[model samples]
Target chain A: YFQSMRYGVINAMAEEKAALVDAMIDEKKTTIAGKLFHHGKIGHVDVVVVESGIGKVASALTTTLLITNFGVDAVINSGSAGALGTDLRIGDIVIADYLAYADADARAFGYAYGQVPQQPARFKADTDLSNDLSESYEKVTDARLVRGLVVTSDSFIASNEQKQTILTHFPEAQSAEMEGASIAQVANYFDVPFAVVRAISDNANGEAGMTFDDFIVEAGQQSAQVLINFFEAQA
Target chain B: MRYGVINAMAEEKAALVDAMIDEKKTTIAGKLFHHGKIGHVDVVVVESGIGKVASALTTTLLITNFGVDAVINSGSAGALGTDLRIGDIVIADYLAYADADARAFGYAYGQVPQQPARFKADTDLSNDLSESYEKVTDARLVRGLVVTSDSFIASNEQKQTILTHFPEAQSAEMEGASIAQVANYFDVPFAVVRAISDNANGFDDFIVEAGQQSAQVLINFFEAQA
Candidate 1:
């Protein structure tokens, strides 16, 4: 009776993890190679939720494990990100149409500014999945939702100087975070349907100062509920 | 018997392979792992491919699958140290990502979010390697910071940008810091050693030459212990 449409949902922090794990039906936690993976279902859809501590390398390792060890059919990276779009405000849902490295520069090798040689300059988020995320999000609160680019680098974008550099390249990017592109990088390699959903938790530039602690739980849950709705709709 | 070595280049991996005795080869995650004895130490060696993600994957598997007590990363790098020259060895006392900046979150410029600003290399391991290389060869060896990124650093502007953040970054490479990050996460002590093969001006085949030097020093470390 199970077609086994396994979905991998990866988050970068604990607050971002609680809502998903709290809602999992028949949840079972398994540790593989030191990474903890939550096995369960949301309604009738199977999902594996993992918390890949911040930054690209850890996220990359965690993503690989999900595909290789968990046999996930698709990967959805959900988390809280700093806002970059003028139209975006805190708690706005940004479903990444694409993800790119805001800091990688290998221009010496003639690769695009953000392109890591051998990989596309930017990873195009899975189209059908992005549409599905928007639909699921629309089913939630009337909070603002923008489907566009999100950038990832090891750094948190929260200063005017750094934020300006990112905008120069990804002029229309809506959010900035630490791990989305790397997740896309791994998913791209494995040929999986990959998507990213982020809730704006802070301003990317330092002009308006606020700490992530202030909005993490609130913003994290906002984005997570949308993911929950997406899985439930699959049933 | 507690050591595992990872190199980004096959040439670097080969030097260690050739030095080992009682060798056995196995394949995992598309990489050929060579396990054998170098002098009296049981060492497992693998080519971790290149770049941060590739090396991170290899380091995770290296620690989890092989059960290595400590990890060692050796390869060639582009010079960033003012005093460095081709074939000079640089032992990473600290490692960071030159291209990673998350300063807005209160992290130091090179620090990745949620990770220590600079990854501290194992003191004991670094000291031993420093001592071992001095006793074995005349090649200049210095303990300094090594920065890594997915990009192959080969320009004046990028080099200058990196130096602006990390004044003491001595070499630029593609894998050490990532290996250090994985080793740190697993709470496994690690040491990253590199030999300069190029500078900002770029180009050349000194790659094989520098790779040999770094690998030779590692062999010496094991040989002296034996």
Candidate 2:
């Protein structure tokens, strides 16, 4: 799973994911030090949850480690994000059907903005996984579950001005975060099925910071529970 | 030595400074570059911050302002290959960007147009680093391809993507290829040495410890050459 710092997505897991036993606390091996826990099964899904550090680089590292070390079958990124779409309310869920980087300006090099020339402008989530998440979200929560584009960048969208900048490049973006698109790109590269599920924590306006602080934990919990509900259904 | 040393973090930079003498610090574009001597080697070290853009800026500064004869990038990276372990050292023979694609413009995945898809490290410098690595630490020394990207890789799927593009890459890092790209453009000799800080399977910790270990390895290598 992928998440930025501050939202306590891992903390939410500690509370919701059951039978988690400390596996390794080795801190001298990696930069974003994390503890490994053997999170027993949630139905048929044998779960081992870990945090990937924030940003594109950290998220990419976490994604790769899961594939190269743990050999996870599929990757899911659940976190809180600032809502860019007007239809999304604070607490609504945004399931990313398409993911793209809002800051990847390769155009001067002859690629589309936010796109690598050889790669599509956006990476599509696994249809079945996304559908399952959307359905499970609807069953488990009353918050609106919207499937649309999620834009990622290293910059946080704190104001409508910044939000508009991203919107100019990705008009379809419903929410913004820092790591989803890179994770999508990596998943696509490895041919691994993946999905990104974000709970809207703020409106991405000037007051985004306060709203983010107020709602981040709740939003993260909402997203995690929905993911857990989906896994339970899978079993 | 007239060497330009680049690190992405302050901790890594500190480890290098601990073994040097006559240290002087200078700032360029809000970044700091430390000029010092390790034994008889004249070295300029800088913390390039994190990511490719930060790295490219510092590397360019090292070449144009510091007039470094060669550049050496030292840092920590996540393991991409099954054979790599934490604390292992990788000496890059080839460098490429796992996320770069201009394929629609007739470039291959991970390739930049008008440039070789892969950049080769300075052979002599890499060989020296490898030989020094063998003597300084018990950590396994691997010489192979390294993939760089702006994104921090945190998933198995991400690792697989890099491997798909650069099948030979043993390690994934944030800055090496960008610096290598800059060096190539300037026709400067460059080498990258990375300590495996994570297997790309778990969250990273032990960076300070692993960074210290890698720094020690680098210092020892310099001592050996000196």
Candidate 3:
């Protein structure tokens, strides 16, 4: 649920007209911009997609507003992420099993050192859906697709030091990105299904020869392909 | 050992009411509300109705309107929480109030705003009561943040969204945060003690069938608290 519609693999695929549904500028206000996307077949499965700018707060508010206003069935957070966990190498897929607000890492609610007072982390992707996706991947390609905890933060975790600091708080977390957690929360509130899948374009290990300029297109392409294949099978 | 209890019971649950009235040397304060005096402990009790808003208002009345020193919100909440087991007791330290009542009170009550409106900050009543509660209750009591929303959270996606903003929160409830808001406003002390009645994960078929049994367990918890 990033702000601009062009950052993630989904947007890249949408550009190619791979998605059956398209976007329309419903309305525009002074402080906010509202656009709606009818991404999938309407009657079969109601797929209402939105782009709620970047960062945790904005993403969360926008997602909440969508669910409150329109009865969204689930949220598919399409975005790029930086890999942090040792288990995940560069160019691997990460599913957010948990979420964390880095700025809110304090002892306000009976939490101590090394313990971040956190909400019950969002629900993992439905087991059935995850299994289906994983099985489908085995049938097609050998490229490694790893699924584990992806933590959501407001800022970019480009440095090894910052990534380590976050890992210190959420050790199980393998990667860092923005917007996933808020989307997860909004889905949870509406009791709708939701999941965040990110294709890693950066190692999040700082400037050890890691950059997004080279491999982002490929990563986005791979992500979009996955979305298309998954939807086709489900539909 | 100053303990306060708030119970939400229908008028028909007279057996439980009779049990409470008989065991505690209670001074009849009102028709549905009463004050029980035991030695140096003067515990105020109110029989609230089912639902989050009703419980919240009762908590406010007890804390600000009734002048109670401290309060313990005792009720059975839906068990949508992952770690929560059937009959497991939850002690809420922090709570998210998503009920529209925030809008009802407007900007003055500091319920809803882009940022935390500063009429009053949230309270920390658990700091004072945690030690005592742990010392007395053998039932496993977990402490974390809880979300107070108007709707029942029936899915993981919904639970996750709340976790996004308030990362520390572990459970969700209806009235706890609103009551906490009132307590904070009055500068009084309060804590939320809930029994896991049903899991809000998928559907609440089991919880709907087990309501009366769960309500009985909460009443027993109140007795134990006293």
Question: How well docked is model 2, in DockQ terms?
Answer: 0.03
Per-model TM-score of chain B: 0.92, 0.92, 0.63
Model 2 per-residue lDDT tens digits across residues B95-114: 98776554545666776554
Count of backbone clashes, every candidate in sequence:
1, 34, 20
What does candidate 1's lDDT look like per residue over A129-215, in tens digits? Answer: 899989987888787788898888887666677778888988998877888988898888778889988878764433464566867
Give lDDT per model, in order.
Answer: 0.82, 0.70, 0.51
Candidate 1 displacement at residue A87 in angstroms = 3.0
Docking class of 2: incorrect
Error of 3 at A22 (Å): 6.7
Query: TM-score for chain A of every candidate model?
Result: 0.91, 0.81, 0.73
Query: Tens digit of lDDT per residue, candidate 2, span A78-173?
Result: 777767987666777888889987766545456677774446778999998789878988898898778899987655556657778888888888
Instruction: Indicate the worst ten consecutive residues by lDDT in candidate 2 chain A.
Output: A2-11
> Model 1 RMSD to the real structure?
3.1
- The alpha-carbon deviation from the true structure for residue B78 of candidate 1, after best TM-score superposition, in angstroms, is 2.0
By DockQ, the better pick of 2 and 3 is 2
